[PDB]
Write a protein that binds this ligand. Sequence first.
Ligand SMILES: O=C1Cc2cc(Nc3ncnc(Cl)c3Cl)ccc2N1
Ligand SMILES: O=C1Cc2cc(Nc3ncnc(Cl)c3Cl)ccc2N1
Ligand SMILES: [Cl-]
Ligand SMILES: [Cl-]
Lengths: 124, 124, 4, 4
Amino acid sequence: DSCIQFTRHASDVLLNLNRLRSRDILTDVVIVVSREQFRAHKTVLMACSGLFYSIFTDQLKCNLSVINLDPEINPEGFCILLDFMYTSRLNLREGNIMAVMATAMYLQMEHVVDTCRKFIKASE
Amino acid sequence: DSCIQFTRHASDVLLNLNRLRSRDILTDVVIVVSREQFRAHKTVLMACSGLFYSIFTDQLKCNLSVINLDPEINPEGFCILLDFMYTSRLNLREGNIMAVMATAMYLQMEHVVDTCRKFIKASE
Amino acid sequence: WVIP
Amino acid sequence: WVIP
Ligand SMILES: O=C1Cc2cc(Nc3ncnc(Cl)c3Cl)ccc2N1
Ligand SMILES: O=C1Cc2cc(Nc3ncnc(Cl)c3Cl)ccc2N1
Ligand SMILES: [Cl-]
Ligand SMILES: [Cl-]
């Protein structure tokens, strides 16, 4: 086509989606990770994660307001990944890298899994 | 913070949101523009438009499944802007620029209004 | 704005 | 991935 493109549009959309999440506006699901609860938008979770994409395209699970993750999932690792989904920024630290990589593998977030593998390889 | 950032994350999220729109997955509103209907996600519309942000933060309108726009709004102009919201690409042409600018003014999409003004000024 |  |  002959379209023009606004470079900052995708980033501005994601920033506003994160502002809606922070103010709990039109969030339609709560993700339960052991004793912890995280409110989010199903569309953003699907757009970022192969696991959520599969869950919310399922004809019965698409209608659930609560999703319980596997008990082995670490709430902090999930929190870091949820923040990444809504900001593009990943808080990867020596103290959390193992939990973040395991959570990214479970959530099917291949780019996160990739950077965790590389950061671990460098420390070996 | 000490975060790392994935450059293509925002663009990849928007691409997946557009794929969900194309397959009519988790769309929660229909925008009526005279004889034409457009299905969308309320969160994306709010993230892109000052008008939709005001509508869907309203305690009664947040729950409506149908929103009717002003009869002066051109369906093609709306379609072009809805495509822009979900892709960052604006199909701006001599034959549609007036309808696109008027629709962008109504929807409160200031960056679109700005490029329309500049493209019109250049042709004068 | 750019030409993509 | 970059340092933002
Ligand atoms: O590493 C990742 C990130 C990811 C996201 C999704 N999401 C979608 N993919 C295709 N079309 C649609 Cl409509 C969506 Cl929402 C699926 C798989 C994966 N894997
Ligand atoms: O030109 C534009 C594009 C736009 C979007 C929105 N959206 C939001 N703004 C602030 N926080 C939130 Cl939560 C959202 Cl969703 C409001 C005004 C405007 N004006
Ligand atoms: Cl990822
Ligand atoms: Cl805009």
